[PDB]
């Protein structure tokens, strides 16, 4: 259900595998920001969700360090998978950048991403 | 610096190992919410941080299912590791429940946790 | 043209008046949660925005108490007015409920609402 | 008990009076950021909170423009007042900047402020 290739509205690409385990491993590619190429991601999801039509809860993290670049920052996404004719993953995310502590008040960005199968 | 046992203001236990590749592995134990004993965590962090006194960006995830129970939910922490007088990890987090499409507007909580080694 | 009647994706109604001194006044009606009928709102906005195509920052608050019910909660919306063809207000919101000390960790929901005039 | 002068962990000064209609009005002076002097704030609070000892739900907004500068931003604070000897106002905030559509994804900062007397 979750395993496969997913696209968000910014055009980043998300490529995951869900292990029978509860694990999320894959790579991420961002259309925007101080990013170039694919980054390692990792996460967890509910491998035994409710069968009432409720969504499947999950999350993952990306640190923006790869051989190409280091933005000194990390994003985590927290959301739920929703199956159907139009499967979706609706998410909210937090992007934190390393700042000195005098500038810590401005270290974190928030937003939302929606990923679809097409 | 990062690897070790951390406690937050809530009394939760964050047992983390920082692998040289930027991986975070370990185990989380919450003293609040619909949870008991240890849950698997995974995450990532900036393995080559900045030297200007800036802190170290990181993030991780817990999906709240183990051998004893399943809350059908997931939490992600995003924040930064700061050295100094005493070590600390400052985070903001997002916690999403699996819900129906109708209840999704109230699926996600937000907070901030401060982890220290005491 | 912030002044006017808007709706979001839940079907709630946002009726506003934007002052020349930079004030926002009006009523809010929600289609979901612990609410019925109209509620007072108040906010501020940038009265002298940038003319470089940037949107106009604004924000407002609703305390969910009127003559018919009281949910012991307040929602603040923070976002911007996008002028043009399809005028929209894009927001992110924080909904805080009054809680006991026990429950403060779970006091605050985060989400996002999109308002249009259609 | 919300009325008066409050300071947060950043050294900023919040001067506010709470109206009997659940109105919040006053002044904010930020110790940090693209700011100088005072700014008008306005917001709302639960004027009949739960008598179980729950905190008092509130929020306010500051747009960062005065006669000295205009930062083209607005912050909203959402939180609860908690009375008693260590009275506090515990908040989470959203700081949104005017952006072009291409940079909307990074328009909004999130933080937390604890105000104390
Ligand atoms: O630090 C950087 O600028 C790189 C971060 C990548 C941009 C973000 S992560 C949240 C949002 N969703 C995306 O697909 N891209 C942006
Ligand atoms: O669904 C549940 O109730 C279990 C989630 C655990 C509660 C949270 S996660 C954020 C915060 N930090 C903690 O240590 N515990 C709570
Ligand atoms: O349930 C409450 O505590 C009061 C009603 C809250 C309604 C919320 S505010 C965010 C979202 N957008 C809406 O139009 N309604 C909900
Ligand atoms: O830089 C700007 O855009 C205007 C100043 C913003 C200051 C912020 S608002 C949240 C936080 N709390 C404070 O007291 N100051 C900062």
Domain ranges (residues) in chain B: 1-118
Q: Cα(C12)–Cα(B10) distance, rounded to whole angstroms?
A: 36
- Give the residues across from D17 on adjacent strands: D25
Helix (H), strand (E), coil (C) string for B35-50: CCCCEEEEEEECCCCC
Q: DSSP string of C82-104?
A: E-SSS-EEEEEEEEEE---STTG
Look up tokens 């809350």; give the residue.
Answer: B71
Q: Decide if B41 contacts B24 (C-beta within 8 A).
A: yes
C68 is in an annotated binding site: no
Experimental method: X-ray
Q: Cα(C22)–Cα(D117) distance, rounded to whole angstroms?
A: 29
For B104, the 3-state DSSP assignment is: helix
Could you give the C-alpha distances from A5 to A1, A88, A117, B50, B74, in angstroms and in order?
11, 12, 7, 33, 21
Name the nearest CA neighbour of A90 among A6, A17, A4, A1: A6
Q: Are strands B108-116 and C4-7 parallel, antiparallel or unpaired?
A: unpaired
- Closest-approach residue (CA) in chain A for D9: A105
Q: Cα(B60)–Cα(B2) distance, rounded to whole angstroms?
A: 13
Q: Cα(A62)–Cα(B59) distance, rounded to whole angstroms?
A: 7
Which ligand has the nearest atom to the CA of B108?
2
Gap from D25 CA to chain C (nearest CA, Å): 10
D:57-76 residues touching chain C, CB 8 A cutoff: 57-65, 70, 72-76
Is residue C62 within 6 Å of ligand 3 at its C-beta?
no
- Name every residue whose Cβ is closer than 8 Å to that of residue B93 and which is 6 or more positions away in sequence: A94, B75, B76, B77, B78, B110, B111, B112, B113
State the Cα angle at A55 between A111 and B30, rounded to 5°. 75
Distance A46 CA to ligand 3 centre (A): 27
Both structure tokens of D39: 């700014």
Class assignment of domain D1-117? mainly beta
Q: Decide if B17 contacts B24 (C-beta within 8 A).
A: yes
Domain B1-118, CATH: 2.40.128.30
State the Cα angle at A52 between A50 and A53, rounded to 5°. 95
Q: Cα(C104)–Cα(B113) distance, rounded to whole angstroms?
A: 12
Q: Decide if C115 contacts C12 (C-beta within 8 A).
A: no
Both structure tokens of A7: 């696209």
- Name every residue whose Cβ is closer than 8 Å to that of residue C2 and which is 6 or more positions away in sequence: C16, C18, C24, C45, C56, C58, C81, C89
A:1-60 residues touching chain D, CB 8 A cutoff: 10, 32-33
Gap from C5 CA to chain D (nearest CA, Å): 20
Gap from A45 CA to chain C (nearest CA, Å): 20
Q: Cα(D5)–Cα(B12) distance, rounded to whole angstroms?
A: 34
| Chosen from B11, B78, B102, B110 to mutate, greatest number of chain C CBs within 10 A | B110
Name the nearest CA neighbour of B58 among B13, B110, B17: B17
Q: Cα(D73)–Cα(C80) distance, rounded to whole angstroms?
A: 9
Q: Cα(C15)–Cα(D109) distance, rounded to whole angstroms?
A: 26
Q: Out of C94, C105, C110, name the one closest to residue B32 (CB).
A: C105
Q: Decide if C105 contacts B10 (C-beta within 8 A).
A: yes
The CA-based diameter of chain D, rounded to the nearest angstrom, is 48
Q: Out of D41, D77, D96, name the one closest to residue C57 (CB).
A: D96
- Name every residue whose Cβ is closer than 8 Å to that of residue D85 and which is 6 or more positions away in sequence: none
Measured in angstroms, the resolution is 2.1
Look up tokens 């900062």; give the residue.
Answer: D109
Q: Decide if D47 contacts D21 (C-beta within 8 A).
A: yes
Burial of B67 (0-12, 13-18, 19+ CB in 10 A): exposed
Alpha helix locations (H) across chain B?
none
Distance A79 CA to ligand 1 centre (A): 16
| Contact across the interface for A109 and D109, Cβ inside 8 Å | yes
């Amino acid at each position: 259900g979750i395993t496969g290739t997913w696209y968000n509205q910014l055009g980043s690409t998300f490529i995951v595998t869900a292990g029978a385990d509860g694990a999320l491993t894959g790579t991420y590619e961002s259309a925007v920001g101080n990013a170039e190429s694919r980054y390692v991601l990792t996460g967890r999801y509910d491998s035994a969700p409710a069968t009432d039509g409720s969504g499947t809860a999950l999350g993952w993290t990306v640190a923006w360090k790869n051989n190409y670049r280091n933005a000194h920052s990390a994003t985590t996404w927290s959301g739920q998978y929703v199956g159907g004719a139009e499967a979706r993953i609706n998410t909210q995310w937090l992007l934190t950048s390393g700042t000195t502590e005098a500038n810590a008040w401005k270290s974190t960005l928030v937003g939302h991403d929606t990923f679809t199968k097409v």
